[PDB]
Paper text:
Here we present high-resolution structures of the A- and B-capsids and in-situ portals of human cytomegalovirus. The portal proteins are believed to orchestrate nucleation of the procapsid through the formation of a portal–scaffold complex, which facilitates procapsid assembly. During the maturation process, the disassociated scaffold proteins are expelled as the viral DNA is pumped into the capsid through the portal located at a unique vertex of the icosahedral capsid. All three capsids possess a mature icosahedral shell and are distinguishable by the inner capsid material: (1) C-capsids are filled with viral DNA; (2) A-capsids appear empty and are assumed to be products of aborted viral genome packaging; and (3) B-capsids have a featureless inner core consisting of scaffold proteins, likely generated by an unsuccessful initiation of DNA packaging.
Numbering used by the authors:
A (entry chain g): 44 to 52, 61 to 138, 145 to 150, 165 to 290
B (entry chain a): 246 to 294
C (entry chain B): 1 to 49
D (entry chain h): 5 to 242, 255 to 304
E (entry chain I): 6 to 245, 260 to 306
F (entry chain B): 197 to 245
G (entry chain a): 393 to 588
H (entry chain M): 1 to 176, 300 to 464, 468 to 591
Write the structure that this text describes.
Amino acid sequence: QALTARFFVAQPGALLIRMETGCDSPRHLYISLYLLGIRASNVSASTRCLLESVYTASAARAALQWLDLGPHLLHRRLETLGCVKTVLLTCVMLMIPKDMYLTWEETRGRLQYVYLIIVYDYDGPETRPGIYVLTSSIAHWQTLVDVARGKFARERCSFVNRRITRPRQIPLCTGVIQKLGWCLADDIHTSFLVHKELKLSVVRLDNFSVELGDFREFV
Amino acid sequence: LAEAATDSILDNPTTYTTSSGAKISGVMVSTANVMQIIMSLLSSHITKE
Amino acid sequence: MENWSALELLPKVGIPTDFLTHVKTSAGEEMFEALRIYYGDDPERYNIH
Amino acid sequence: EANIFCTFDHKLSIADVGKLTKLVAAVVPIPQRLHLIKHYQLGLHQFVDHTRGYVRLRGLLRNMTLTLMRRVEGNQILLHVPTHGLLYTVLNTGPVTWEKGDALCVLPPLFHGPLARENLLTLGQWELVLPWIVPMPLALEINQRLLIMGLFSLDRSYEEVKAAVQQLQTITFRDATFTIPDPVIDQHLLIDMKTACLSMSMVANLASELTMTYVRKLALEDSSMLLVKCQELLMRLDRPQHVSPDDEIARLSALFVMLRQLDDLIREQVVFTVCDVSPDNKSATCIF
Amino acid sequence: ANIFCTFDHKLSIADVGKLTKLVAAVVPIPQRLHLIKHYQLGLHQFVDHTRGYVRLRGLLRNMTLTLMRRVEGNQILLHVPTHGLLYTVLNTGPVTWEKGDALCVLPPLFHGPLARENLLTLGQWELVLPWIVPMPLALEINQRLLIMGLFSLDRSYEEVKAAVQQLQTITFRDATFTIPDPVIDQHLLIDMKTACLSMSMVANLASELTMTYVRKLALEDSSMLLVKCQELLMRLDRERSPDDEIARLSALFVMLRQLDDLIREQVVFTVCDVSPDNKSATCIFKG
Amino acid sequence: VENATLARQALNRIQRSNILQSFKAKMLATLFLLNRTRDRDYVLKFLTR
Amino acid sequence: FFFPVGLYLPEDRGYTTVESKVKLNDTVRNALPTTAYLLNRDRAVQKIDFVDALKTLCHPVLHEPAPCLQTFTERGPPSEPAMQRLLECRFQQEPMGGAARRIPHFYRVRREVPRTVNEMKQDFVVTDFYKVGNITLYTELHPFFDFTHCQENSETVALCTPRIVIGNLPDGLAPGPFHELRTWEIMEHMRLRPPP
Amino acid sequence: METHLYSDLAFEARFADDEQLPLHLVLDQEVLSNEEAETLRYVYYRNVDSAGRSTGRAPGGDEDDAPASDDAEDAVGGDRAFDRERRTWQRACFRVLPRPLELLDYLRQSGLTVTLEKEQRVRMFYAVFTTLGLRCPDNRLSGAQTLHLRLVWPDGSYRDWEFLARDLLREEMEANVARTDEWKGAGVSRLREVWDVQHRVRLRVLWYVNSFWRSRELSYDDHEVELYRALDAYRARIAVEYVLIRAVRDEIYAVLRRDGGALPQRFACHVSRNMSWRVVWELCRHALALWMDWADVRSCIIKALTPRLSRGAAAAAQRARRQRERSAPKPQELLFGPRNEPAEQTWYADVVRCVRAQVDLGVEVRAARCPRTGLWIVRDRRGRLRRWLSQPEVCVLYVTPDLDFYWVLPGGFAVSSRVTLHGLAQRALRDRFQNFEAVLARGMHVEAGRQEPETPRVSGRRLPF
Amino acid sequence: HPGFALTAVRTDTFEVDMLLYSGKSCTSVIINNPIVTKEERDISTTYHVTQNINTVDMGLGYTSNTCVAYVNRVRTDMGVRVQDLFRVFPMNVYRHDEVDRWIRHAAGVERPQLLDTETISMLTFGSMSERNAAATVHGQKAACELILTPVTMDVNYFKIPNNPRGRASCMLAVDPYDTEAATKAIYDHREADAQTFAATHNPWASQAGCLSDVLYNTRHRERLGYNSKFYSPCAQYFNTEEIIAANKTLFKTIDEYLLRAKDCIRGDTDTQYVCVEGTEQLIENPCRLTQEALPILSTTTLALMETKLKGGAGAFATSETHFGNYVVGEIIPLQQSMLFNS
Amino acid sequence: LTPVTMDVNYFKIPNNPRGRASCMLAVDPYDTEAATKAIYDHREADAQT
Amino acid sequence: PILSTTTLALMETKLKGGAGAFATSETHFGNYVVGEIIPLQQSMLFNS
């Protein structure tokens, strides 16, 4: 059930994320999901080094200019658009790296939803985000935020430690949960991909039905 | 196996009668290989009619 | 909970029978779902309401 | 994938299927979401267990999926999962009067009082217990009131808690009466109160120095009834120098998100919203 | 699921010629009836002297909202959207739309304006449409109205007047608005007053209830989050009967439940490709 | 052909395991036909299969 | 299917119904079984021993007698007053420095002490333990724990105490000759079957 | 480690209105059992001053210098003493780590740093962490102010430990960013064991060097006459049950002197003409002396008096007196009104045996009145009959919930009397064994009178999660 | 060899073709004309077409006799690999952490696992913790065991097909609708059992509250932390409430056998996971109806297995005994001449 | 070879001489991790013995 | 597996064997026999 547009910009499995530019002429920018792999801190350093090696542009330097401009405010600029039918390009309003994908079950529930999970660290100098994507079977939001509070207690401790050690600096949240649609339990498969003659470890989701959610802030 | 089963009471003595007066008194169904073992073992009693 | 009066009053079709075990053994050992074993003679089939 | 079949080990009499055919377009939850199911997981009686917690059932029935019963013809019940958006017709057995604007949320069936507890299908070990469909203000009042039962009653004897919750269990909403029987203090209640404590401490710390003194300024200025209520609620323990616009903007943003993560414990996302109620208050045509 | 609407008064040709410009825009209506008189249509029936804007937001949140489709002789083809399928709208909001945002619906803030809806009026009636603004500007201007109302109780001083004059301005992409005060002549509107009162008193109830409930909670299994919670409370403090606490907690919950037109801004649309002049945009109705 | 294995069916684990068991069984047991047995009915049944 | 491993057969009734068909070496790893040999799906020999059995025998659930103690309190005191006679023992606190002189003051009464249930479990042969003439079959519930009913403050309570040694296993269930056969095994494990 | 930080900060908080110090404690297997510590509900404390016997009562004197005087309806000064003694007990912070651990290695693996004079080995099996408060009334602290400490179990049973202030501070008084991270960084000064008063229980106290109590400049003195007054207070608090026992003993001797000893039969056991009774009389004397020897607080009359002290016994005594003071029934209430209705008694017993010199103290017994006669017949709590009235080598004492009395020699002959608590005051009888009613915590329902689920049971065998 | 001797209990599924025989005109078949149902999909249309069948069995008794005929494929391996008891009770750790790390190192399981909350057991049908290995040359595997007494006479007990718990627990032979006599028959030891006229044959297995009753009873395995997906083959013998529930009349008992008493086991994993709602296969059990189990060919020394494999016809069913060694002779000769005729 | 290795169920049954399974049918298709695990690795057993 | 003794006595008792004696697999004290599963010597040499 395709609902398409045209988006002024090789795999079909990409999530166009519309991030807001601090510069005033574009007012926004369409970054794909793989370039949060370079800002994530849960990821392996080798895959981060590979994506830093392949994708240096002037717009990548402006991307690091305008995402690290305002820290702990990235959820005010985070905005998804759905999946790619073909790559100017189009996007409907699934390729995932191996370490940014995680599951807290035996992933043996038949119908399972997907969920973008981000977290905000504070125990270092300022802020290190960690990008996740959570394939889970829970449908209701409160039970999901209970198991997220159960699985991410150290980030809550870091949140309250930032609120007690830097009183002039105000945080906003500890992260974002947001659904995107569902894949079944059988087409999820550890897999392989080579882009521009490079080895990168990818796990794929095949039968996706796109159905978005909202960026629900939680603690 | 034949004499252990009780006969039914919805009895139709017109249907399922062979030529030369033999009345059918049951059906014995199995797979390919068990039936061909029965045929290769008990071939003397088989009357293909 | 059934209408056994309809079983005892309505006109019936006859059958040749062959039970598996004895009939009273088929009564006391619950082979069917609904049974109405009364000994002697019961006049319960007459109060037509 | 859309129609869910089921079966019983019993057969179905004309009395039982006559009890059941009146329940066309009635809501029945499913724990599993599979194509063919058994009737020993249909409904809710697989999950009911008294002296375990009404709040555990409130957190558990919240997690099941929902279906609508129709087209019964003999060993086929045909639950039908509603698609996201089309107009459906439902039927409620939970005795609450409805309204064209009020949305709906599902609650486990509390006891109503008459010691009827109607189960409408009685088998050898399994009755059929049915989820209540109730309007949104009663759902919010139920959630906030059993959270009051949880949060208020820590470190107290049974006597003053008995005298409080004997009058606090009653909700008189639209000429009815209600009772919240099992508010028992579970680990689920402890993590709910822990999130409530964290959110209350955050909105107590990172709110402004001028929002704390707003009602004090209205006390010094104005006189109303709820102002007298605020003075009796706060007065027992009793020129702006600092101005900062953008810090107040970020402060209200943080106050908003922490109020939202306090409010999430009682406010469920809606499951049905009506377009018409039947005037004898039996069925309704609602969109979800 | 198509709606109709008839006007009782004489309707001219200039009024239709200025109304049919609004061929595809949102018009919220109080009850989903199949035929509705035009007095209920729109938002003119709600505005008055004493009540302000937060009342309009609260009644518009629980109100259903539909789409205007076509015009006829004296029947108006309103059409309620369905969840998931996509439609076209117009832009009555004053901000240029772009791709893929999330539109909100808020009551318009130009009450008694310089545009005056093209003099599309009848006898003691006027049509008015709500703004359709994307979400960051929506909850931004919600915060702006809120802390404009907070400063309103001591405004005799002059630096707070310049602070309010800063708050009255706004910034966006090629967008400057001047959203007027809730205060007019040394008094406040009652729904704005009860909104800021509800949030200030739930803040105070938190400030004098958390110091009880960290001790009434922490005698269970303690955590590092709990000692850091009392650390936060104790830095806040050193910076300086059942019958009462049951009322404190009940008033806590019911007064935080009066901010529900502020704390949750519920998305109603998803933007698709836009038009040149940025007045029209196909979109997906959500919720 | 001893089990339903039409060519569009994709096998799970235990099916392939008993297929391999039967591979080794019918490779060891019936490797050379006419050097082991000179029986009429065995070569008839084998050629029929 | 079911098959036993490691069973010890009685020796006084010992019989060999094969003598010419098989002949073995007299080392006692062959004159006392400890493992079993079975058949696979294909007809092949395979070993089942205690080495694979530590995936079940070394579990924390095997060593908890609290369900056994709860069900022994549930099905609690015995039936007959004829079996109230063998079930009295006391766990008190006596100052032992006084007891070192009070030992002749204990025997100055002339009333007999009844034997407890553990003494009642060793006056049976290995083939009479499994008959209805035996009394203590309602007590032998676990190979790691001894059970009894003993009156503390004059009420019969159930109590489980772990047999910390395997020597505390009763001789109807682990007899003397089996123990000496285990010693012959443990001497052959250290290459000492001729003793010095 | 965790609850020490919280309670230390909370005692920084509440120092303005209640002036106590943070006395952090840990305990071990030398005090409470693993089955007893796995299910431990909540700990309690209330410290006794040198001249005043509590804190929650009035500062100078009290009303508790009046005796109960063997009243019937008001058991011990009514029920105001119940809420008064409940008001003086405070609830303390609490945690149990139910797994084997080395304290120095556990605090080293956690955030703290140990700086001891020497690294001795404390091998303990499970650690329960709690903080109590010794109260400084002025800046001055008294060396005879003792600190009591309860351990409350979910059934309602409790043990009682208490200890003075000389053994808590025998050395640590004679040796004189955020808060949490510096508390973690500097940490614990040292560790020493503290004993109770009766040298029974060895538990350990933890002295943290980042305690704010070091910054209050507390003064201290331990005089001899204050320690002697604390010795007399402890003498009374130990002598309460024992003077009740002596009142029972001279009650039995006086009621034997009164009627001479030609005492009737009050229990249902047969007798034979031929058997001599000089032997059973000498056995009665020897066994009463033996019961005088092995007298203990865990006995029949004390556990019979424990549910007497609460408010429910006062309400049941009022309604039972109103029911037993009721006139002859009239036909007007018999014919139309609600009709009226004490099935079988709930006693306690001490059974003493002369030939084996073993008394058995805590016994429950359900008595019954035999229908054929006016005699008493005892039965077990399960339902079997009690055959100790056959044995000529035994004796048995009895006590009613009416607090009547039966001392029964072999043959069912009972020396009847009543208990005497005229010679005892109120405050010791309350604060020794006042029956405590449970407060709401995890695992229990809101309204009273409900079926209870399983305990929370913070477990040492299961994964605790 | 320690001071106890295990009896092992395993299950063994099969692929079997059973023939059937029914009398003439036994069950009338009632069919109808089919109905079509249109459904609107995105581009194309599916036409659901149904047809109903009613079947009136017109014999008094059972009119159709079937017989298990010919085994061809053995689905499991008939192996010896031990039931992974660490995965079925994932909660229970030892008290001391070092002895638990040392036991998990000396065993195979790498860590204690945390079993999920009950809502995930509602949404997902179960846990299924054990991961399938890379070797599947034998099939799926299961073998569990019962700790017994090492004196236990096999001659009365392990040669003939018998109950592995010691007491006869077949409620066909007891009075129907009598719970007290059933509990007196299968639990009381002041009177002998029915199979052999002795008390028991393994007193750690029969008593209500033994280790077998706290390791296998599904009424009593819920208290300690257990997993509902691993199929214990002894659970058909130790589930006491499931056994006393079948204490009925023999015709309703045989209808329970031919209708209800068929388990399902999932057929794509190498560990026997409990299938939920079998709609593609069904595992019928005669060894739950008869409440016994059959002895498999086991020896103790190699050379006695060699003299079994050296013999021919009529060799797998004898039962020889050396001095301390033994061989239990199987009663069903399926190891001898099922794969021999292949 | 190593001179200890058992022969009673290894050397007299059809078997692979490398020691392990190496059958390549019992593994899942197109899963090289489980392939190289079950041919080479030694934290697990073969499907044969 | 093919026929492989380790002492000549087992080869002699298999060369004196009439029919099917090649199928067995016998073991002495440390001296063994691998028995064939394909009866190859009997078949191919009985065909001569």
